[PDB]
Each structure stands twice: as C-alpha cells, then as structure tokens.
CSV table of C-alpha atoms and ligand atoms in Angstrom, one decimal:
chain,number,residue,atom,x,y,z
A,27,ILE,CA,-6.3,-9.6,15.5
A,28,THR,CA,-5.1,-9.5,11.9
A,29,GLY,CA,-7.4,-10.7,9.1
A,30,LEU,CA,-6.3,-12.5,6.0
A,31,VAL,CA,-8.3,-13.2,2.8
A,32,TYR,CA,-7.1,-15.6,0.1
A,33,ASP,CA,-9.2,-17.7,-2.3
A,34,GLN,CA,-7.7,-20.1,-4.9
A,35,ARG,CA,-10.6,-19.3,-7.3
A,36,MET,CA,-8.7,-16.0,-8.1
A,37,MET,CA,-6.1,-18.2,-9.8
A,38,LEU,CA,-8.6,-19.0,-12.5
A,39,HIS,CA,-7.9,-15.8,-14.5
A,40,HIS,CA,-5.0,-16.3,-16.8
A,41,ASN,CA,-3.5,-15.4,-20.2
A,42,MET,CA,-4.8,-18.0,-22.6
A,43,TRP,CA,-2.1,-17.2,-25.2
A,44,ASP,CA,1.0,-17.0,-22.9
A,45,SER,CA,1.8,-19.4,-20.0
A,46,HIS,CA,4.7,-17.3,-18.9
A,47,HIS,CA,3.0,-14.0,-18.5
A,48,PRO,CA,4.1,-11.8,-15.5
A,49,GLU,CA,0.5,-11.6,-14.1
A,50,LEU,CA,0.5,-15.3,-13.3
A,51,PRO,CA,-2.0,-17.3,-11.2
A,52,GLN,CA,0.8,-18.6,-9.0
A,53,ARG,CA,1.4,-15.1,-7.8
A,54,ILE,CA,-1.2,-15.4,-5.1
A,55,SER,CA,-0.7,-19.1,-4.4
A,56,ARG,CA,3.0,-18.5,-3.7
A,57,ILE,CA,2.3,-15.6,-1.4
A,58,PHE,CA,-0.3,-17.7,0.5
A,59,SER,CA,2.1,-20.7,0.7
A,60,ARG,CA,4.8,-18.5,2.2
A,61,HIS,CA,2.4,-17.3,4.9
A,62,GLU,CA,1.9,-21.0,5.8
A,63,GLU,CA,5.7,-21.7,5.7
A,64,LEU,CA,6.5,-18.7,8.0
A,65,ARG,CA,3.8,-19.8,10.4
A,66,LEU,CA,1.8,-16.6,9.9
A,67,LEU,CA,-1.4,-18.0,8.5
A,68,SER,CA,-2.4,-19.8,11.7
A,69,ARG,CA,-2.0,-16.5,13.6
A,70,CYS,CA,-4.6,-14.6,11.4
A,71,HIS,CA,-8.3,-14.6,11.4
A,72,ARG,CA,-9.4,-16.0,8.0
A,73,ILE,CA,-11.8,-13.6,6.3
A,74,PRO,CA,-13.8,-15.3,3.5
A,75,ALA,CA,-13.8,-14.0,-0.1
A,76,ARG,CA,-17.1,-12.9,-1.6
A,77,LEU,CA,-18.3,-11.5,-4.9
A,78,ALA,CA,-18.7,-7.8,-5.3
A,79,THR,CA,-22.1,-6.8,-6.5
A,80,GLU,CA,-22.7,-4.7,-9.6
A,81,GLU,CA,-24.1,-2.0,-7.3
A,82,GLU,CA,-20.8,-2.0,-5.5
A,83,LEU,CA,-18.9,-1.8,-8.7
A,84,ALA,CA,-21.0,1.3,-9.6
A,85,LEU,CA,-19.4,3.1,-6.6
A,86,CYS,CA,-16.5,3.9,-9.0
A,87,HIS,CA,-17.3,2.5,-12.4
A,88,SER,CA,-19.7,3.3,-15.2
A,89,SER,CA,-22.5,1.0,-16.2
A,90,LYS,CA,-21.0,0.6,-19.7
A,91,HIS,CA,-17.6,-0.5,-18.3
A,92,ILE,CA,-19.2,-3.0,-15.9
A,93,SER,CA,-21.4,-4.4,-18.7
A,94,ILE,CA,-18.5,-4.8,-21.2
A,95,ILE,CA,-16.3,-6.7,-18.7
A,96,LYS,CA,-19.2,-8.8,-17.6
A,97,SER,CA,-20.0,-9.6,-21.3
A,98,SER,CA,-16.5,-11.2,-21.7
A,99,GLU,CA,-17.4,-14.2,-19.7
A,100,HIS,CA,-19.7,-15.5,-22.5
A,101,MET,CA,-17.1,-15.0,-25.3
A,102,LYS,CA,-15.2,-17.6,-27.3
A,103,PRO,CA,-11.4,-17.2,-27.2
A,104,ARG,CA,-11.3,-15.3,-30.5
A,105,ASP,CA,-13.6,-12.6,-29.1
A,106,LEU,CA,-11.8,-12.5,-25.8
A,107,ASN,CA,-8.6,-11.8,-27.7
A,108,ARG,CA,-10.3,-9.0,-29.7
A,109,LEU,CA,-11.8,-7.4,-26.6
A,110,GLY,CA,-8.6,-7.5,-24.6
A,111,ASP,CA,-6.6,-6.0,-27.5
A,112,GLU,CA,-8.9,-2.9,-27.3
A,113,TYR,CA,-7.4,-1.9,-23.9
A,114,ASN,CA,-3.8,-0.9,-22.9
A,115,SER,CA,-2.1,-4.1,-21.5
A,116,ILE,CA,-5.1,-6.4,-20.8
A,117,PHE,CA,-5.6,-10.1,-21.3
A,118,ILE,CA,-9.1,-11.6,-20.6
A,119,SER,CA,-10.3,-15.2,-20.0
A,120,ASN,CA,-13.8,-16.5,-19.4
A,121,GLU,CA,-13.0,-16.5,-15.6
A,122,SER,CA,-11.7,-12.9,-15.5
A,123,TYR,CA,-14.9,-11.1,-14.5
A,124,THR,CA,-15.6,-13.6,-11.7
A,125,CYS,CA,-12.0,-13.2,-10.4
A,126,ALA,CA,-12.2,-9.4,-10.5
A,127,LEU,CA,-15.5,-9.6,-8.5
A,128,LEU,CA,-13.8,-11.9,-5.9
A,129,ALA,CA,-10.8,-9.6,-5.6
A,130,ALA,CA,-13.0,-6.6,-4.8
A,131,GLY,CA,-15.5,-8.4,-2.5
A,132,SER,CA,-12.6,-9.9,-0.6
A,133,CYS,CA,-11.4,-6.4,0.1
A,134,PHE,CA,-14.9,-5.2,1.1
A,135,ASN,CA,-15.2,-8.1,3.6
A,136,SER,CA,-11.7,-7.1,4.9
A,137,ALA,CA,-12.7,-3.4,5.3
A,138,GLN,CA,-15.9,-4.4,7.0
A,139,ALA,CA,-14.1,-6.7,9.5
A,140,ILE,CA,-11.7,-3.8,10.3
A,141,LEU,CA,-14.4,-1.1,10.6
A,142,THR,CA,-16.7,-3.2,12.8
A,143,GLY,CA,-13.8,-4.1,15.1
A,144,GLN,CA,-13.7,-7.8,14.3
A,145,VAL,CA,-10.0,-7.4,13.4
A,146,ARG,CA,-7.6,-4.5,13.8
A,147,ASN,CA,-6.0,-4.8,10.4
A,148,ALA,CA,-5.8,-7.2,7.5
A,149,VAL,CA,-4.1,-8.4,4.3
A,150,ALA,CA,-5.8,-9.3,1.1
A,151,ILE,CA,-4.0,-11.7,-1.3
A,152,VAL,CA,-6.0,-11.0,-4.4
A,153,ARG,CA,-5.7,-10.8,-8.2
A,154,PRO,CA,-6.3,-9.5,-10.8
A,155,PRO,CA,-5.0,-6.1,-9.6
A,156,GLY,CA,-6.9,-2.8,-9.5
A,157,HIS,CA,-5.1,0.5,-9.4
A,158,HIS,CA,-4.8,1.1,-13.2
A,159,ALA,CA,-8.5,0.6,-13.8
A,160,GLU,CA,-10.4,3.8,-14.5
A,161,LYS,CA,-14.1,4.7,-14.1
A,162,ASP,CA,-14.8,3.7,-17.7
A,163,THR,CA,-12.0,1.4,-18.8
A,164,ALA,CA,-9.6,-1.5,-18.0
A,165,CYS,CA,-5.9,-1.0,-18.1
A,166,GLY,CA,-2.6,-2.6,-17.1
A,167,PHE,CA,-3.8,-6.0,-15.9
A,168,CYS,CA,-6.7,-4.3,-13.9
A,169,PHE,CA,-10.4,-4.5,-14.6
A,170,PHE,CA,-12.0,-2.8,-11.6
A,171,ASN,CA,-10.3,-0.5,-9.1
A,172,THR,CA,-10.3,-2.7,-6.0
A,173,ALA,CA,-8.7,-0.2,-3.7
A,174,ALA,CA,-10.9,2.8,-4.9
A,175,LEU,CA,-14.0,0.6,-4.6
A,176,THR,CA,-13.0,-0.4,-1.1
A,177,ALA,CA,-12.6,3.2,0.0
A,178,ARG,CA,-16.2,4.0,-1.3
A,179,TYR,CA,-17.5,0.7,0.2
A,180,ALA,CA,-16.0,1.8,3.6
A,181,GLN,CA,-17.8,5.2,3.4
A,182,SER,CA,-21.0,3.4,2.4
A,183,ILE,CA,-21.0,1.4,5.6
A,184,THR,CA,-20.0,4.3,7.8
A,185,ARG,CA,-20.6,7.9,6.6
A,186,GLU,CA,-19.9,9.6,3.3
A,187,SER,CA,-17.1,11.8,4.8
A,188,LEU,CA,-15.1,8.9,6.4
A,189,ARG,CA,-11.4,9.9,5.8
A,190,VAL,CA,-9.6,7.2,3.8
A,191,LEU,CA,-5.9,7.3,3.0
A,192,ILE,CA,-4.7,5.2,0.1
A,193,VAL,CA,-0.9,4.7,0.0
A,194,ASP,CA,0.1,3.2,-3.3
A,195,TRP,CA,3.6,1.7,-3.1
A,196,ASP,CA,3.3,-0.3,-6.3
A,197,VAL,CA,6.2,0.7,-8.6
A,198,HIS,CA,3.6,2.1,-11.1
A,199,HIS,CA,1.4,5.1,-10.8
A,200,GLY,CA,-2.2,4.2,-9.9
A,201,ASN,CA,-3.7,6.4,-12.7
A,202,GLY,CA,-7.2,5.1,-12.0
A,203,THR,CA,-7.1,5.7,-8.3
A,204,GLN,CA,-5.8,9.3,-8.8
A,205,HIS,CA,-8.5,10.0,-11.4
A,206,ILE,CA,-11.4,8.5,-9.3
A,207,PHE,CA,-10.5,10.7,-6.3
A,208,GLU,CA,-9.0,13.7,-8.0
A,209,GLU,CA,-11.7,16.1,-6.9
A,210,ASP,CA,-12.3,14.5,-3.5
A,211,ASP,CA,-11.0,15.7,-0.2
A,212,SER,CA,-12.3,12.6,1.7
A,213,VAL,CA,-9.9,10.2,0.1
A,214,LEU,CA,-6.2,11.2,0.3
A,215,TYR,CA,-4.2,9.4,-2.5
A,216,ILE,CA,-0.4,9.1,-2.0
A,217,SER,CA,1.5,7.3,-4.7
A,218,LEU,CA,5.3,6.6,-4.9
A,219,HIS,CA,6.2,5.4,-8.4
A,220,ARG,CA,8.9,5.1,-11.0
A,221,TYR,CA,8.3,7.9,-13.4
A,222,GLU,CA,11.3,8.6,-15.7
A,223,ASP,CA,9.9,11.8,-17.1
A,224,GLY,CA,6.7,10.0,-18.2
A,225,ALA,CA,8.5,7.2,-20.0
A,226,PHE,CA,7.6,4.4,-17.6
A,227,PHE,CA,4.3,2.7,-17.7
A,228,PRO,CA,1.5,4.0,-17.6
A,229,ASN,CA,3.4,6.7,-19.6
A,230,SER,CA,1.4,9.8,-18.6
A,231,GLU,CA,2.4,13.1,-17.1
A,232,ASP,CA,-0.6,12.7,-14.8
A,233,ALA,CA,1.8,11.0,-12.5
A,234,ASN,CA,4.1,14.0,-12.0
A,235,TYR,CA,4.4,15.8,-8.7
A,236,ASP,CA,2.6,18.9,-9.8
A,237,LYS,CA,-0.7,17.0,-10.1
A,238,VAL,CA,-2.0,17.9,-6.6
A,239,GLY,CA,-5.7,17.4,-7.1
A,240,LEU,CA,-8.6,19.5,-8.5
A,241,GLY,CA,-11.0,21.8,-6.8
A,242,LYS,CA,-11.8,20.8,-3.3
A,243,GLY,CA,-9.4,17.9,-3.9
A,244,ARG,CA,-6.4,20.2,-4.2
A,245,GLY,CA,-3.7,18.9,-1.9
A,246,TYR,CA,-5.3,15.5,-1.6
A,247,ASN,CA,-3.3,13.9,-4.5
A,248,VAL,CA,0.3,13.4,-3.6
A,249,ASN,CA,2.5,12.0,-6.5
A,250,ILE,CA,6.1,11.1,-5.5
A,251,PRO,CA,7.8,10.3,-8.9
A,252,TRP,CA,11.2,8.8,-9.2
A,253,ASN,CA,13.6,9.6,-12.0
A,254,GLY,CA,17.0,8.2,-12.8
A,255,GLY,CA,17.8,6.2,-9.6
A,256,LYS,CA,17.5,2.6,-8.7
A,257,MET,CA,15.5,3.4,-5.7
A,258,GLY,CA,15.3,1.2,-2.6
A,259,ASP,CA,14.9,1.2,1.2
A,260,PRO,CA,16.7,4.5,2.0
A,261,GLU,CA,14.7,6.4,-0.6
A,262,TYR,CA,11.3,5.0,0.4
A,263,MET,CA,12.1,5.5,4.1
A,264,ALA,CA,13.1,9.1,3.3
A,265,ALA,CA,9.9,9.7,1.3
A,266,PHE,CA,7.9,8.3,4.3
A,267,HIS,CA,9.7,10.5,6.8
A,268,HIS,CA,9.5,13.8,4.8
A,269,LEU,CA,6.2,13.4,2.9
A,270,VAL,CA,3.9,10.4,3.5
A,271,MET,CA,3.8,10.4,7.3
A,272,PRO,CA,3.6,14.2,7.9
A,273,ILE,CA,0.8,14.6,5.4
A,274,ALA,CA,-1.0,11.4,6.6
A,275,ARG,CA,-0.8,12.5,10.2
A,276,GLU,CA,-2.3,15.9,9.3
A,277,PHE,CA,-5.1,14.3,7.3
A,278,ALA,CA,-5.8,12.0,10.3
A,279,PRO,CA,-7.3,9.1,8.3
A,280,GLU,CA,-9.9,6.8,9.8
A,281,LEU,CA,-9.0,3.9,7.5
A,282,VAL,CA,-5.7,3.2,5.6
A,283,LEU,CA,-5.7,1.2,2.4
A,284,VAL,CA,-2.4,0.1,0.9
A,285,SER,CA,-2.3,-0.5,-2.8
A,286,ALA,CA,0.5,-2.9,-2.0
A,287,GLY,CA,2.2,-3.9,-5.3
A,288,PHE,CA,5.6,-5.6,-4.7
A,289,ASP,CA,7.0,-4.7,-8.1
A,290,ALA,CA,9.4,-2.1,-6.5
A,291,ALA,CA,11.0,-5.1,-4.7
A,292,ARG,CA,14.6,-6.3,-5.1
A,293,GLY,CA,14.4,-9.0,-7.7
A,294,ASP,CA,11.4,-7.7,-9.7
A,295,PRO,CA,12.0,-8.2,-13.4
A,296,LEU,CA,9.8,-5.2,-14.4
A,297,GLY,CA,10.2,-2.6,-11.7
A,298,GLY,CA,14.0,-2.3,-11.7
A,299,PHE,CA,14.1,-1.2,-8.0
A,300,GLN,CA,15.5,-2.7,-4.8
A,301,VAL,CA,13.1,-2.3,-1.9
A,302,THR,CA,13.8,-5.2,0.5
A,303,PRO,CA,11.3,-7.3,2.6
A,304,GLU,CA,12.6,-5.5,5.7
A,305,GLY,CA,12.0,-2.2,3.9
A,306,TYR,CA,8.4,-3.1,3.3
A,307,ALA,CA,8.1,-4.2,6.9
A,308,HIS,CA,9.2,-0.7,8.0
A,309,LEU,CA,6.7,1.0,5.7
A,310,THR,CA,3.9,-1.1,7.0
A,311,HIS,CA,4.9,-0.5,10.7
A,312,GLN,CA,4.9,3.3,10.0
A,313,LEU,CA,1.4,3.1,8.5
A,314,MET,CA,0.2,1.1,11.6
A,315,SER,CA,0.7,4.3,13.6
A,316,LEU,CA,-2.3,5.9,11.7
A,317,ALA,CA,-6.0,5.5,12.0
A,318,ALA,CA,-5.8,3.6,15.3
A,319,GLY,CA,-4.1,0.9,13.4
A,320,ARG,CA,-7.0,0.3,10.9
A,321,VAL,CA,-4.8,-0.8,7.9
A,322,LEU,CA,-5.8,-3.0,5.0
A,323,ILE,CA,-2.9,-4.2,2.7
A,324,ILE,CA,-4.2,-5.0,-0.8
A,325,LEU,CA,-2.0,-6.9,-3.3
A,326,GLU,CA,-1.5,-5.0,-6.6
A,327,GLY,CA,1.5,-5.9,-8.9
A,328,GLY,CA,4.7,-7.7,-8.2
A,329,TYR,CA,6.3,-10.3,-10.5
A,330,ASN,CA,9.1,-12.1,-8.8
A,331,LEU,CA,7.4,-14.9,-7.0
A,332,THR,CA,10.0,-15.2,-4.3
A,333,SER,CA,10.2,-11.4,-3.8
A,334,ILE,CA,6.4,-10.8,-3.5
A,335,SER,CA,6.0,-13.8,-1.2
A,336,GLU,CA,8.7,-12.7,1.2
A,337,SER,CA,7.7,-9.0,1.0
A,338,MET,CA,4.0,-9.4,1.6
A,339,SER,CA,4.7,-12.0,4.4
A,340,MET,CA,6.9,-9.4,6.2
A,341,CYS,CA,4.0,-6.9,6.0
A,342,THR,CA,1.6,-9.4,7.6
A,343,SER,CA,4.2,-10.1,10.3
A,344,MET,CA,4.2,-6.4,11.1
A,345,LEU,CA,0.4,-6.2,11.2
A,346,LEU,CA,0.5,-9.1,13.7
A,347,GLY,CA,2.7,-7.0,16.0
A,348,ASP,CA,6.1,-8.5,15.4
A,349,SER,CA,9.1,-6.4,16.0
A,350,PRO,CA,10.4,-4.6,12.9
A,351,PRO,CA,13.5,-6.3,11.6
A,352,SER,CA,16.8,-4.5,11.7
A,353,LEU,CA,17.6,-2.0,8.9
A,354,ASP,CA,20.7,0.1,8.2
A,355,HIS,CA,18.9,3.4,8.8
A,356,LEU,CA,22.0,5.6,8.2
A,357,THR,CA,22.5,4.8,4.4
A,358,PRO,CA,23.0,7.8,2.1
A,359,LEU,CA,20.2,8.5,-0.4
A,360,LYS,CA,20.5,8.4,-4.1
A,361,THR,CA,20.9,12.0,-5.2
A,362,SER,CA,17.9,12.0,-7.6
A,363,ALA,CA,15.6,10.8,-4.8
A,364,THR,CA,16.3,14.0,-2.8
A,365,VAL,CA,15.4,16.1,-5.8
A,366,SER,CA,12.1,14.2,-6.2
A,367,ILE,CA,11.3,14.6,-2.5
A,368,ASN,CA,12.1,18.4,-2.6
A,369,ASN,CA,9.9,18.8,-5.7
A,370,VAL,CA,7.0,17.2,-3.9
A,371,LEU,CA,7.6,19.4,-0.8
A,372,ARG,CA,7.5,22.5,-3.0
A,373,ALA,CA,4.2,21.4,-4.6
A,374,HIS,CA,2.5,20.4,-1.3
A,375,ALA,CA,3.7,22.9,1.3
A,376,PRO,CA,0.8,25.3,0.3
A,377,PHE,CA,-1.7,22.6,1.4
A,378,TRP,CA,-0.1,21.0,4.5
A,379,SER,CA,1.1,23.0,7.4
A,380,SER,CA,3.2,20.0,8.5
A,381,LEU,CA,5.4,20.7,5.5
A,382,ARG,CA,5.9,24.4,6.4
B,15,HBJ,C1,6.8,-1.3,-27.3
B,15,HBJ,C2,6.2,-1.5,-25.9
B,15,HBJ,C3,4.9,-1.7,-25.7
B,15,HBJ,C4,4.3,-1.8,-24.4
B,15,HBJ,C5,5.1,-1.9,-23.3
B,15,HBJ,N1,4.5,-2.1,-22.0
B,15,HBJ,C6,4.8,-1.4,-20.8
B,15,HBJ,O1,5.5,-0.5,-20.7
B,15,HBJ,C7,4.1,-2.0,-19.5
B,15,HBJ,N2,4.0,-3.5,-19.6
B,15,HBJ,C8,2.7,-4.0,-19.3
B,15,HBJ,C9,2.4,-3.9,-17.8
B,15,HBJ,C10,3.3,-4.3,-16.9
B,15,HBJ,C11,3.1,-4.2,-15.5
B,15,HBJ,C12,1.9,-3.7,-15.0
B,15,HBJ,C13,1.5,-3.7,-13.6
B,15,HBJ,O2,0.3,-3.7,-13.3
B,15,HBJ,N3,2.5,-3.8,-12.6
B,15,HBJ,O3,2.1,-3.9,-11.3
B,15,HBJ,C14,0.9,-3.3,-16.0
B,15,HBJ,C15,1.2,-3.3,-17.4
B,15,HBJ,C16,5.2,-4.2,-19.9
B,15,HBJ,O4,6.2,-3.6,-20.0
B,15,HBJ,C17,5.2,-5.7,-20.0
B,15,HBJ,C18,4.2,-6.4,-20.8
B,15,HBJ,C19,4.3,-7.8,-21.0
B,15,HBJ,C20,5.4,-8.5,-20.5
B,15,HBJ,N4,5.6,-9.8,-20.7
B,15,HBJ,C21,4.6,-10.6,-21.5
B,15,HBJ,C22,6.8,-10.5,-20.3
B,15,HBJ,C23,6.4,-7.8,-19.8
B,15,HBJ,C24,6.3,-6.4,-19.6
B,15,HBJ,C25,6.5,-1.7,-23.5
B,15,HBJ,C26,7.0,-1.5,-24.7
B,16,K,K1,2.4,3.6,-6.9
B,17,K,K1,-8.0,12.8,-3.6
B,18,ZN,ZN1,2.8,-2.2,-10.8
C-alpha cells in the first residue's frame, strides 16, 4: 500500500503583495488534481493531515524561532511585511504558521503510517516547503524544516539511532537540513543541487562537495554540486549510480525521506535544468530498493505547475509498483557532471568502502 496526504488548507498561505509569486497555492492543488486525472489517487491510502505540535517543532528548532513564526499569525499586514523582510526570501501571511504546522504534521502521520506497517511508502503533497529552514531562522520560502523534523519524529517513535537517509533532489541545496544533521551519524544527508561556484541560491560555499560533515558526522553529509551544465536525466542517473546508491546501500537506512523538490524539472522557470518525469520515476524506483521500501516523498520546491504535477505523479506511480517507464539509458553525460561526480568520489572515498 502507498499512502498519500494532501489537504487544501495548505493553500491558505500566500504572498499578499504578489499574486504571481512562484510559491503559489495552486502548486499543491495542481499536483493533487493530476493524481486524480491519472487515476492514482484512488489507488492510495489517504493519510490525514494533522498539526505538528510545538514540542515536535522543538526537535529541530529553537524556542525563539518557533515563537517568532507563531507570533506572525496575530499581525496586521504591515507587520507581516516587516517580519518577512527580515529573512532571506520569505513572505508571510496570517495563515503561514498554521500551514507550516500542517505540512510537518502531515509528514509525521506519513512516517508513522510507514514505520507501523500501515503503508509501505507514501507521498506528501505539502507546502510551504522546508529544507532551507534552519534551527533558528526561516529562509527561502521555508519556515520549519519538514524533512528534518520528520527524521527526528521517526526516531522519537522508534529508537534514537534509527538510521534515516534524506535524499534532497530539489535543485537548491538544503542548507537547513545539512546544518541540522551536520554532526549526526544517524541521519545521512545527500543533496544534489545546482551550485555554480556558490553563485546560485542559497549562495553559500556550505553546499560544496568538500563539506562532508563534522565530528562523528564526517562522511554523513554528501553534497553533489553542479556547475556549468544544464543537467538532466543522464547526469542524475549517473550521480545515483556512482554516489547516491552505493553510499545509501552501505549506510543501510531504515527509513528514506526524499526532499522532493521538482525545480530541477524540464520546464522549471527557476532551476534551469531538464530532469524529465521519467527521470524522476527512475530515481524513485532506485530509492525503493532501500530500507525494505520504506520511502516517504515530501514536496519541496518546483514552480512549473505542469512539470511538478507530472513529475510527482510519476513518483507516486513508482511507489505503487508500476513498471518504470522507458528511458534512453545510453545517453552521454555533460562533461561538467563527470567532474562533479569525481570530485564527490574523491571527498567521500575515505568514508565509504563502496567507493574504494
Ligand atoms: C538581486 C537578487 C536578489 C535575490 C535573488 N534571489 C535568488 O537567488 C533566489 N530566489 C528566491 C528563491 C527561489 C526559490 C527557492 C526555493 O525554495 N526553490 O525550491 C527559494 C528562494 C529567486 O531567485 C526568486 C525570487 C522571486 C521570484 N519571483 C517573485 C518571480 C523569482 C525568483 C536573486 C537576485
Ligand atoms: K538538493
Ligand atoms: K549527517
Ligand atoms: Zn528549490
């Protein structure tokens, strides 16, 4: 069984000053509608949304950050505008806090359904996104780090040392997820992201391949940064073959979370990349070979409504057990992708015998 969570209340968060903002309420409704059109919704077990609690938010976030985001829901528009402007790339409305609580709680209910055996795997069609949010601050359309919180929630309902893999295929680096787990060997973070020598959002050298983790976490942070090329299916498939899957298999996760932005998709106006819906299906199907299939796909970014709807629907089709669609596997890689892959191999060979 595959679970699906979607709740139209998460559409209530919006940019009060721009009706054409990329992080649009219709992102989640279009994805949900496409699941109905492709006859996937009726095949899934519907998992209800719920609110995260403040104690659950404190698994990854500071009390001050929780209280400031909570305080926004009382503010008049002028004060919402001021507060949002204090962060990097954030808009806030009076519904934002509630929507962020529902995004996280939806994912907790999904992780619980997987870990208790009610479903094998699941998809969560949620907003606002999470992976840029830090312990102490909001960033990049994200208020609380839904995927990071879900990893800690999973440990909280099992054992502290439950091995959780987070694969982040959003086109942007999940700076918050990296930082939250940087010293932690129980949560392996693997991000693929457009980097451009630190020029691309979120504009930090923390996203480079030589950031391998700290302390006991050394080797448990895998950054795969792309420079120069318009990356697509062959480059992501090659990164999975040489890096993501060998490392993940050696880590032997007990739960896989996907920070599944669809902003690397063909058609995305921000990402500039060309991963196809069939490409995302192949990435999902590979991850399904891990953790006895216990995979939760969590929406992050993605800004072409057609692209994200087709891409995420293809991922759900794979979770349901459908045959992976045909792909032209032979295609030659862009030259800069091979350079990136080799840089990651050089940085991570000391930590992973599967790369030696
Ligand atoms: C001079 C200058 C200043 C700032 C920037 N900002 C960036 O570099 C990143 N951001 C914001 C952003 C985009 C996507 C994500 C994300 O979470 N993705 O998953 C997270 C954050 C954008 O570029 C952006 C912002 C607004 C847009 N509107 C209203 C059409 C379009 C693009 C660039 C130059
Ligand atoms: K990423
Ligand atoms: K880590
Ligand atoms: Zn993104």
